[PDB]
Amino acid sequence: CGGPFELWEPNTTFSSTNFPNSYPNLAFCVWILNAQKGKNIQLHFQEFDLENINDVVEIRDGEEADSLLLAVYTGPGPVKDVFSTTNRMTVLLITNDVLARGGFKANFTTGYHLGIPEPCKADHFQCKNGECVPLVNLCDGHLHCEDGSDEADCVRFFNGTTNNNGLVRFRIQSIWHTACAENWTTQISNDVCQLLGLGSGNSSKPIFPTDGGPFVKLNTAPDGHLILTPSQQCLQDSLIRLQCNHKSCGKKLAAQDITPK
Amino acid sequence: IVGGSNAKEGAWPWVVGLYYGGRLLCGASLVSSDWLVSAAACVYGRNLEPSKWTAILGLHMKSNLTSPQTVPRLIDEIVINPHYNRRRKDNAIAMMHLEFKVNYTDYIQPICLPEENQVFPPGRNCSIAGWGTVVYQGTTANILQEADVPLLSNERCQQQMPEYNITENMICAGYEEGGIDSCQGDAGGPLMCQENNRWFLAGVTSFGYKCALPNRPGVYARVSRFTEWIQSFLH
Ligand SMILES: *[C@@H]1O[C@H](CO)[C@@H](O)[C@H](O)[C@H]1NC(C)=O
Ligand SMILES: *[C@@H]1O[C@H](CO)[C@@H](O)[C@H](O)[C@H]1NC(C)=O
Ligand SMILES: *[C@@H]1O[C@H](CO)[C@@H](O)[C@H](O)[C@H]1NC(C)=O
Ligand SMILES: *[C@@H]1O[C@H](CO)[C@@H](O)[C@H](O)[C@H]1NC(C)=O
Ligand SMILES: *[C@@H]1O[C@H](CO)[C@@H](O)[C@H](O)[C@H]1NC(C)=O
Ligand SMILES: *[C@@H]1O[C@H](CO)[C@@H](O)[C@H](O)[C@H]1NC(C)=O
Ligand SMILES: *[C@@H]1O[C@H](CO)[C@@H](O)[C@H](O)[C@H]1NC(C)=O
Ligand SMILES: *[C@@H]1O[C@H](CO)[C@@H](O)[C@H](O)[C@H]1NC(C)=O
Ligand SMILES: *[C@@H]1O[C@H](CO)[C@@H](O)[C@H](O)[C@H]1NC(C)=O
């Protein structure tokens, strides 16, 4: 309850309260590891052996009253390192009153962009896992980046205030733009419904051509994937005002009866 | 839930139970075919070993588990809310990813998430589900107990619950005279409130001061403030 407190750059290596023996029960310590402005924090563990879920380490990244969370470590084993974002990594210890363990150690060396891999510039799209894919998987129908960021949502709506409504805003690889409805059918309608995470198309109809952006030509084929071609040759273009209903949400699908008793 | 009634088999397909090493600990509400939503008060300190967790989908009777409607699944990823705080009891929600996808059967259906700019008015009759405990100092029930619980205002809840700082991100629901409220062993139970012939997720069972007590309702996590956060993991 009255252990160590905020440290700085020189003092790095520190135990919780007592390394050669066990920590006292009912203890609530705190180590507010700080650094200079613009520097992140690193929390590699050289030794870590604590009790079960009853004893955890609520690693915080607050810097203010609205504290965030980074990791909650417990039990034995070489737990993974923690890489904060702000320059104030708060470490709160919460222990029970039964079967206290030895302790742990932490060597926090600050720096810049520790943990997060350096993104590759010069036309190299960096998916959220650190992998680089310049143009091979820029929303083309592949799953190279295992986190799904390579095939992430490159489609959205426009003036679509509610949930399942809006324009036909489409991004081929880089630029967002609309499309055309010269060959628009219910098949591709439900296809783009499912691609947008929605139900089936209710009523698809255009309104008027608003902008002269590089609209795309939507087509159909038995290969499953829709054919797209961003050709800027279309007079009085019909911008799709897609009205897609929602998917099968939490409605009673079983064959229940009516027994009000 | 203490004063709950036995629910019809299939009336709540989006209410599953989370087993922690062969033992039911807390309940969860299935939102997508691979991502669940449960209270962070149970996965706190247990997310390091997701393989130990296991979620039975479409479970109605624990003893009647040999039925083909119950599809077991293994957990491989747990994501706790970043703004979680165990001391202040704020934002106690955490999603759980599934190993393999599951088909939407007759007894397995996804729940609807509350959209933004949609407030639930207090005093609205809508029930909950989950393995409610019949008696505080006893054991839970094998059947899915359920009962209607009206919604209350945040100001009235703060006046009735001065022990906890009730913020905007929490919504309470409980009888004025008590008797029927969520109890232990049912953390993470969904606050399913019907809206236009469709049930939503208007709250997650975070905790409870004293279940089945007058003027002592249960505080639920307001899911309407975390719609985009949950939807960011559904894809
Ligand atoms: C580091 O620890 C020493 C020893 O207790 C202390 O005197 C000093 O104030 C600490 N902080 C520094 C050197 O920035
Ligand atoms: C901290 O000390 C450990 C001890 O071996 C060392 O391996 C590590 O590189 C040091 N710096 C860190 C963890 O930033
Ligand atoms: C969408 O709304 C904006 C409001 O600023 C307007 O300028 C634009 O023309 C609208 N577009 C369509 C397609 O309605
Ligand atoms: C699209 O519609 C035009 C006009 O009806 C027609 O000439 C063309 O063959 C259609 N293309 C496809 C792929 O259906
Ligand atoms: C389309 O929306 C209307 C809303 O009034 C609804 O009645 C109708 O069932 C919907 N149709 C489909 C196919 O979703
Ligand atoms: C469920 O219960 C019934 C009767 O209580 C029994 O016949 C059956 O074997 C049980 N298990 C199932 C249906 O998987
Ligand atoms: C689900 O449906 C697919 C076909 O759409 C089928 O191959 C599969 O066996 C079904 N069951 C599961 C558990 O995926
Ligand atoms: C809600 O249900 C309770 C009993 O379940 C009943 O006494 C009460 O009148 C109901 N309120 C409304 C507004 O339907
Ligand atoms: C709740 O927290 C707010 C924010 O610090 C504070 O202003 C308020 O006094 C607190 N209320 C209670 C009852 O603790």
Whole-angstrom distance between the N-terminal and C-terminal Cα of chain A?
A: 56
Do residues A41 and A35 make contact, with C-beta atoms less than 8 angstroms apart?
yes
Do residues B112 and B199 make contact, with C-beta atoms less than 8 angstroms apart?
yes
B143: nearest Cα among B206, B205, B64, B212:
B64
Identity at A82, one-letter amino acid code? V
Identity at B86, one-letter amino acid code? R
Q: Whose CA is nearest to atom 10 of ligand 2?
A: A107
Whole-angstrom distance between the N-terminal and C-terminal Cα of chain B?
A: 33
Give CA–CA dist A135/A139, Å, rounded. 9
Give CA–CA dist A79/A61, Å, rounded. 18
Q: Which of residues 62-121 of B touch A (CB under 8 A)?
A: 80-86, 104, 106-107, 109-112, 115
Fold of A13-107: Jelly Rolls (2.60.120)
Question: B114-140 burial, b for 16+ CB within 10 Å, e for fewer?
Answer: beeeeebebeeebbbbbbbbeeeeeeb
Is any atom of ligand 6 closer than 6 Å to the C-beta of B142?
A: no
Q: Please state, in angstroms and as integers, the Cα–Cα distance from residue A33 to each residue in A37, A63, A79, A108, B85, following that order.
A: 13, 10, 19, 8, 19
Torsion of CA B156, B157, B159, B164, to 10 degrees: -160
Give CA–CA dist B94/A71, Å, rounded. 13
Ligand lying closest to the C-alpha of residue A9:
1
The number of beta carbons lying within 10 Å of the beta carbon of residue A51 is 17
Question: A94-108 burial, b for 16+ CB within 10 Å, e for fewer?
Answer: bbeeeebbbbbebeb
Q: Whose CA is nearest to atom 3 of ligand 5?
A: A202
Contacts of A56 (CB under 8 A, 6+ apart): A50, A72, A73, A74, A94, B44, B45
Do residues B37 and B200 make contact, with C-beta atoms less than 8 angstroms apart?
no
Domain B15-111+226-232 in CATH 3.10.20.30: no
Do residues B30 and B105 make contact, with C-beta atoms less than 8 angstroms apart?
no
Alpha carbons within 13 A on the beta-carbon side of A24: 8
| Interchain CB distance below 8 Å, B109 and A250 | yes
B17: nearest Cα among B141, B188, B182:
B188
Do residues B69 and B107 make contact, with C-beta atoms less than 8 angstroms apart?
yes
Give CA–CA dist A67/B83, Å, rounded. 6
Pocket test for ligand 6, best of B60, B61, B65, B67 (most atoms within 8 A of CB): B67
A109: nearest Cα among A7, A6, A5, A9:
A9
B149: nearest Cα among B187, B184, B106, B189:
B189
Q: Looking at B50-207, which runs of residues are DSSP E strands?
A: 53-57, 71-80, 94-98, 125-127, 145-146, 148-150, 170-173, 204-205
| Interchain CB distance below 8 Å, A250 and B192 | yes
Ligand lying closest to the C-alpha of residue A187:
4
The atom of ligand 4 lying closest to the CA of A183 is 1
* Structure tokens, B18: 């989370």
Alpha carbons within 13 A on the beta-carbon side of A136: 8
Resolution (A): 3.7
Give CA–CA dist B211/B180, Å, rounded. 8
Is any atom of ligand 5 closer than 6 Å to the C-beta of A22?
A: no
Do residues B131 and B17 make contact, with C-beta atoms less than 8 angstroms apart?
yes
Give CA–CA dist B31/B24, Å, rounded. 20
Which of B20, B90, B109, B230 to mutate: most A Cβ within 10 Å?
B109
Q: Give the technique used to solve this structure.
A: cryo-EM
